[PDB]
Design a protein around this ligand. Structure first.
Ligand code: A1D66
Ligand code: MG
Ligand code: ZN
Length: 336
């Protein structure tokens, strides 16, 4: 497809982890999701799988991106394109290819695209404590993540121009919709240690037990048997989307820094509004007048990133990400 050269130059090496997502953001004028989505989906043959025309896909990527608030510093369409980029990178790795089915690939790439649509730059605890319409609608339970999947399907199937599912066999659509919803909901913060532990206990530990049996050709088939069970493929899909969502510390340093600044401003802004409305301050520590962003990035990596990417790396082998993580962890500490 004829694409403006600068945008085509900014999409040259999307297969590499080292990728200039912010040049794509500037070149596309805050529309990187539709340009990166078209190429990623075509590289994975998604519309040939879903029986969608390219025109239906362009309208779908347009309506999803349009519902990403560009006024949010972090939770905008660039974040979705970035998470889509890491999701595609994880799917491309040898371990993931030979364990998940093509319908899992389709679910992952769409889930990453939609996993934060209509995010308002505020946390779930802010919506509940403020009595937001979404907190009432979802009974203070998985407020944002339920909204992300729900609105995404409202926009998709509420218009024949956008429905990238309309030509599917309806049992395939039943399983695809359930998988997408499961991966979107898996991104809720409070579910973190639950999803990490189950991945270690059902995937990492049994695999490690079986790999000390030697390279016997019958061991390989038993390993494939245990891994490709539908429950374990749900566990791998959750771990994958959880890692792609917060993969910022595993990026090149210049990108890791920009991601930290963007997300910090979003939490500083929420604290500003909570003080100005007399609302209970939920993360009382991300306050712009006191918070050290480098120290906070160390706390974030310590609490969420270290053990999770530890298990994900042992299962998939991701040297670039781990070496970036170590260098970025040292840069944040080096600012002292
Ligand atoms: C990716 N990333 C980063 O590199 N730095 C951050 O400081 C950060 C972040 N992502 C967040 S919040 C992402 C949306 C909420 C969420 C968090 C964790 C999971 Cl497992 C799932 C969803 N923060 C900001 C942040 C920093 C610290 N230290 C603590 C929190 Cl609770 C949030
Ligand atoms: Mg989210
Ligand atoms: Zn996200």
């Amino acid at each position: 497809d004829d694409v403006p050269p600068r945008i085509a130059r900014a999409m040259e090496n999307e297969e590499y982890w080292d990728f200039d997502i912010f040049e794509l953001e500037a070149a596309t004028h805050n529309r990187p999701l539709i340009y990166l989505g078209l190429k990623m989906f075509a590289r994975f043959g998604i519309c040939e799988f879903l029986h969608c025309s390219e025109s239906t896909l362009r309208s779908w990527l347009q309506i999803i991106e349009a519902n990403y608030h560009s006024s949010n510093p972090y939770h905008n369409s660039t974040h979705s394109a970035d998470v889509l980029h890491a999701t595609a990178y994880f799917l491309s790795k040898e371990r993931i290819k030979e364990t998940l089915d093509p319908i899992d690939e389709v679910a992952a790439l769409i889930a990453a695209t939609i996993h934060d649509v209509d995010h308002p730059g505020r946390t779930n605890s802010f919506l509940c404590n403020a009595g937001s319409e979404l907190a009432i609608l979802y009974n203070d339970t998985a407020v944002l993540e339920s909204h992300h999947a729900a609105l995404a399907f409202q926009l998709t199937t509420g218009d024949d121009k956008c429905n990238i599912f309309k030509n599917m066999e309806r049992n395939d659509y039943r399983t695809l919709r359930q998988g997408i919803i499961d991966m979107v909901l898996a991104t809720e913060m409070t579910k973190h240690f639950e999803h990490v532990n189950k991945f270690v206990n059902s995937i990492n530990k049994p695999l490690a037990t079986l790999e000390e049996n030697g390279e016997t050709d019958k061991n390989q088939e038993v390993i494939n048997t245990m891994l490709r069970t539908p429950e374990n493929r749900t566990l791998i899909k959750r771990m994958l989307i959880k890692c792609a969502d917060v993969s910022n510390p595993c990026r090149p340093l210049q990108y890791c820094i920009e991601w930290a600044a963007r997300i910090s401003e979003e939490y500083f802004s929420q604290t500003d509004e909570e003080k100005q409305q007399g609302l209970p301050v939920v993360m009382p520590v991300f306050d712009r007048n006191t918070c050290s962003i480098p120290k906070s990035q160390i706390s974030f990596i310590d609490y969420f990133i270290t053990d999770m990417f530890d298990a994900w790396d042992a299962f998939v082998d991701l040297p670039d990400l781990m070496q970036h993580l170590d260098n970025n962890f040292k840069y944040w500490k080096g600012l002292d």
